[PDB]
């Protein structure tokens, strides 16, 4: 018996909206499956023989029944389902690994940018060029308005 304990809202956090229902169904299955496990013990109580050895007057019926029972081996079925989900998990691991690496690149970039913005010239010594560098938005559109004051008079 190898069962992996699980959160459940964490599960809900990682379901893409395209396939919620099936996942939810999956979820449902789990719970009822768990109940169905608690609905019966591990092994059935083996039928004794003496009670039938001394009460079943039929010749050999109890005997050959018990023997063919001992000679019976129930087919314990094999999954053939875990390997594929393992491989799918592996692929998903690769994908999320590359994703998180690229995102960490983006994070260190944001960090460097904020750091640049941190080391700033005290404003009373900054030229309009330094301001335009520190905020490319403040730069005037020398293309749409190539003439003074290079901006709509309204917002002036």
């Amino acid at each position: 018996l190898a069962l992996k304990t699980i959160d459940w809202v964490a599960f809900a956090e990682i379901i893409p909206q395209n396939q919620k229902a099936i996942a939810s169904s999956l979820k449902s299955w789990n719970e009822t499956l768990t109940s169905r496990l608690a609905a019966l013990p591990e092994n059935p109580p083996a039928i004794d023989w003496a009670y039938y050895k001394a009460n079943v007057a039929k010749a050999g019926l109890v005997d050959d029944f018990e023997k063919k029972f001992n000679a019976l081996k129930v087919p314990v079925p094999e999954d053939k389902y875990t390997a594929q989900v393992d491989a799918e998990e592996k692929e998903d691991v690769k994908s999320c690994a590359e994703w998180v690496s690229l995102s960490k690149a983006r994070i260190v970039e944001y960090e460097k940018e904020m750091e640049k913005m941190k080391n700033l010239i005290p404003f009373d010594q900054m030229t309009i060029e330094d301001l335009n560098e520190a905020f490319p938005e403040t730069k005037l559109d020398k293309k749409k308005y190539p003439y003074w004051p290079h901006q709509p008079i309204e917002n002036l």
């Binding site: 018996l1 992996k4 999956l26 092994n43 083996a46 039938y52 079943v56 029944f65």
Partner: protein
Amino acid sequence: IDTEKSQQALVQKRHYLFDVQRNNIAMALEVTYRERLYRVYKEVKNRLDYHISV
């Protein structure tokens, strides 16, 4: 920054999906297996009681 940091832990948690599937696999397996064990136990008990009854 932190939003990306949030996205980091989230994808980090993604592994729950697979093991839950695994959980249902091993569960349903033992279910059908044990169900078979009680099917065979019930059916032989039925014939046994039938003869001792009649």
